[model samples]
Target: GPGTACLTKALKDSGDLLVELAVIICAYQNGKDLQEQDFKELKELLERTLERAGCALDDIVADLGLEELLGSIGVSTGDIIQGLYKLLKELKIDETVFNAVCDVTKKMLDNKCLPKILQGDLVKFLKDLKYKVCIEGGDPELIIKDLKIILERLPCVLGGVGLDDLFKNIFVKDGILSFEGIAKPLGDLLILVLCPNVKNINVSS
Candidate 1:
């Protein structure tokens, strides 16, 4: 009972913290084209909010329910990859930086690295970086493999981090609300969305 109560409290507190961080990030992004002073204040506020949330600048890109948020906003991994390519081509990001970012993204995708509360950050990072490169000429098979690895590992990794229980509590069984509709779409996307990438290359003799 005590453990359950403590866990509940912690979840509530974490949820509030996440919401606060999301608000700060959204405001900062909104003020990106505004006056330098406004941008500076938002940046400072974002930094302080992230520090309070126990994350760093780099980590901010991978925190929160970002992936889900991206999906809600009609952005998928494919969309992200396409967008990153565009941005990179536009900005002409050097090969060195491009490779480094790709390497990091590959690692995250390969490891299925899902922190319990920062799924949003991960999603947002993917969305923001998607337009920085062109994937048309890249090895489709390799890219698919990388994405597949992440998708395959996502549920297990989330489970490892204890979010599975948290998700189950809120979404499983009629505990709070029936998640039948939500579960099917999410599950189907997680499973089949990478198929195109995975099966992109055919070896025909």
Candidate 2:
């Protein structure tokens, strides 16, 4: 309860309200629900609603009684993070505003604040995140940052299931393993996830 408003404060400090607002709109439009999906957009809307009648997020949340929805996933954590990363990069606000928001995001996850509004499959999230970054493009380093945050924040997701089948052929290509084209932190994390006797939680540590 004490630091619950950290997200709000962070958002306020991160840069333009309109830019942050647009990112949230983009995420919600992509189908991130507040009740059952990773509704970072919902939270963003709540954090700072635009003055325009249709732009405010909290009104929708209240009218829909959306806050009661929790732990249900509309999307994976990794996927949306990747989406936001790409979206912000495209907007060219990523290096400045986006990264600032990212710092606060890490705390939200670390403190278990995310599940209150966002929840989803960690493996799928990360897997797709890697796929998007590696193939789809934009800072290869984005993968590293995301993976690092997952390890730091969502330990529960990683520690329990284990990464066996989830990453069976993760870094493998054409039936052969290759790390040549991959990048660090993420590339290394990917290899480690599939590595024998290594835990996903242990990849970063």
Candidate 3:
């Protein structure tokens, strides 16, 4: 539970650079019985890594909620850099994968943190719908339609840079659906983001 608390803080505070690595250690240790040394290892790694990145290790522990997010998704941070690699970034999650992530999380959340579940699901839904209706080769032209689906189906997740950030994160590779193909939805997504109603957007630029 203490480890979970550490990760949750990491998610809420994006400024910490090693938060990602701390999570990897957590997952690695989670499979075995942890010792006092393991706890010290976690604190030390995060501290040393973050210190190099400009923050003290313990300082990174001050605040956060990604512990819940990780529990929900069944994994800690994906540790993505650029594109293609060791871990698939957030954008690559399709319905099957997303569903697995959600299903595990649903069990963990269980009538708790209801808003987080809803907000997270709304975010996941935007991409899930795009991947769901693909006509085998993937469609780039009909996204305005999908955007409409996003607008109508998960309207609460709609708006601003958060929406834009959501859009930015989505990209398809292989028959999996390429991000390049989804360009059709951007103009409208942009318009909706710019609309005055999107005042509480959680992301900016």
Candidate 4:
């Protein structure tokens, strides 16, 4: 689809655009003493540009496969839970709330109960679920553990590639996971997750 193609191109181009726009906004805000009105106008202009480009925020999110990831993770729509457990153990989230979350995720996966639309709503649902989990006096430490597990697990699922290599490339360095230089790798992982298929090829990611 041309819409998908165009959206993909825009996303690939957006990294530099984002930096440029940030510089412009910061410069204007600082040098010209920009007010709320200016910011609002700029925001509207961005919206209009997006609309004209045939890509809105919703389209971007959907195209990026965030909806799918959300669905897969939140409701366990696919093999997400099982895959997560494998990854989680590697991440050392084998017990507590993280494990409980894995249990819940497993149940959901077993039931196969999530609606297709839920995938699109995954981000919002996750935010609310996060709050609810916190309020329920769930283990905060476990929650963090679960979140980290998700963060680590998501790329492999999205990339749909050599899972071992994906983990190694993103996490492990010299046979150990490094904390530094993760942000770009994470971003790369997000792109993989958002678009799981390889272009111009009969391959997934």
Q: Each prediction's Cα lDDT score?
A: 0.36, 0.38, 0.36, 0.35
lDDT of 2 by residue, 69-188 (tens): 567744344343344445334445435433433433343344344453233233234334444333333444554444445544454434233334223323435543333422233345
Q: State which candidate, 1 or 4, has the greater lDDT.
A: 1
Task: Give RMSD (Å) of candidate 1 vs. truth.
Answer: 20.1
Instruction: Give one digit per residue, the lDDT tens place, for model 4 in 1-205.
Output: 3434554455344222222222223222232443565544444443444465455644433443445644344322123223323433443421443333323333222323122111322222233334432234455455434435554423323233343443344443454223233244433423332222112112111
In Å, residue 2's CA in model 1 sits off its true spot by: 30
Separately for all candidates shown, the number of backbone clashes (residues 3 or more apart, or on different chains) is 19, 5, 10, 1
Query: How many Å off is the CA of 131 in candidate 2?
Result: 41
Q: How accurate is candidate 2 locally (lDDT)?
A: 0.38
Superposed model 3: Cα runs more than 4 Å off: 1-25, 64-205
**Cα deviation of 29 in candidate 4 (Å)?**
6.0
Q: Say which prediction, candidate 3 or candidate 4, comes out ahead on TM-score.
A: 3
Model 4 segments more than 4 A misplaced: 1-6, 11-31, 58-205
Worst 10 residues of 2 by lDDT: 196-205
- Candidate that beats the other on lDDT, 2 or 4, i.e. the better one: 2
RMSD values for the candidates in order, in angstroms, are 20.1, 14.2, 17.4, 21.5
Per-residue lDDT, model 4, residue 109, is: 29
Highest TM-score against the true fold, candidate = 2
> Whole-model lDDT, candidate 1?
0.36
